[PDB]
Every structure is written in C-alpha cells, then in structure tokens.
Amino acid sequence: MNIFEMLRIDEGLRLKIYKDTEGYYTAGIGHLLTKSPSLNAAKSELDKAIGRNTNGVATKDEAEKLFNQDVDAAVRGILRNAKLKPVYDSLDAVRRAALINMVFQMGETGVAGFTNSLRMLQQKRWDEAAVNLAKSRWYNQTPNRAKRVITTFRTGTWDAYKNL
Ligand SMILES: [Cl-]
Ligand SMILES: [Cl-]
C-alpha cells in the first residue's frame, strides 16, 4: 500500500465528468474541476487541464496523469505550509500518507484549520487526535472515508485499507 493506491481507493476512477460528494464537477481520480454550477465551465476546465478537446471525457492515461500531478501538488502544498510542514515532518511514512489524503480532499487551507488535531498529531497523542478529528463536518459528511483516514492516524498501519 502507498498514497496512490490509498487515494485511488478513496476517490475511485471515472472517465466522464461527474459530480463529487459536494455536487462539484470533477473528473478522473477526484480531480476537482470547478465549483461553478456550469457543465460547460467544467468541460472547459477539463480541456485546459488535459490539453485537448475532450468533450467531457478523459482517457485512463489522462486521468492518471492528472492524478500524479495532484498528488505531487498536495505534497508540495504541505511542505510549503508553515502549519502543515512541521506536522508532516514529525510523522512516520504511513501517517504522512494520511495527511496527504486529507489535503488532497480538502485543500491545504481546510486541513491547516484543524489546529487542535494537528497539535495532537504532532505530540503523538493518537487516540486523542482521532477523537478530535471526528468532531468535524468532514467526518459527518464522508464518514466511511473519514474513518479510514482516522484509523490510519490512530494505528500507523494500513489496516483500514486492506480488503478494499
Ligand atoms: Cl490541472
Ligand atoms: Cl465516505
């Protein structure tokens, strides 16, 4: 197991433009296209991202390429964020993947907002952080996914993803 596999399980893969859990136009492996209510605006963002007239449909290879870029950007966003960097640096490899997953899903800003949990993770107070992480809209809106990530932070193993 690794970050790619982990996110591929959490996000799935869809070649046509679809609406995510929040109703936003997305494509491929969780690649958010726009928060605008306009399908055309979405088609437009997809073409600009891929570099061709897609007509709202990507190929597998294109999706995978977007995915690689997105993971890369998530990591780099973490390393450049003064509140995130220090946490990431203190964590072991498995837990780091947990933090990347959250950033990919909610953006650097969103995650940096979990002040209390971040402090707990930095201090290595696993059970406590897990409880605090769960008191969030994130957990209430996407509980199955949130549980997988939280277990990952709690245990430091890939147990929640083995079976998937
Ligand atoms: Cl892009
Ligand atoms: Cl979920």
Curated annotation (Swiss-Prot):
GO MF annotation terms: lysozyme activity
Keywords, in A-Z order: Antimicrobial, Bacteriolytic enzyme, Cytolysis, Glycosidase, Host cell lysis by virus, Host cytoplasm, Hydrolase, Viral release from host cell
Q: Where does substrate bind?
A: 32, 104, 117, 132
Enzyme Commission number(s) = 3.2.1.17
Location of the active site: 11, 20
InterPro entries on file: Endolysin_T4_type, Glyco_hydro_24, Lysozyme-like_dom_sf, Lysozyme_dom_sf, Phage_lysozyme-like, T4-type_lysozyme
Protein purpose: Endolysin with lysozyme activity that degrades host peptidoglycans and participates with the holin and spanin proteins in the sequential events which lead to the programmed host cell lysis releasing the mature viral particles. Once the holin has permeabilized the host cell membrane, the endolysin can reach the periplasm and break down the peptidoglycan layer.
The protein's name? Endolysin
The organism's taxonomic lineage, starting at the top: Viruses, Duplodnaviria, Heunggongvirae, Uroviricota, Caudoviricetes
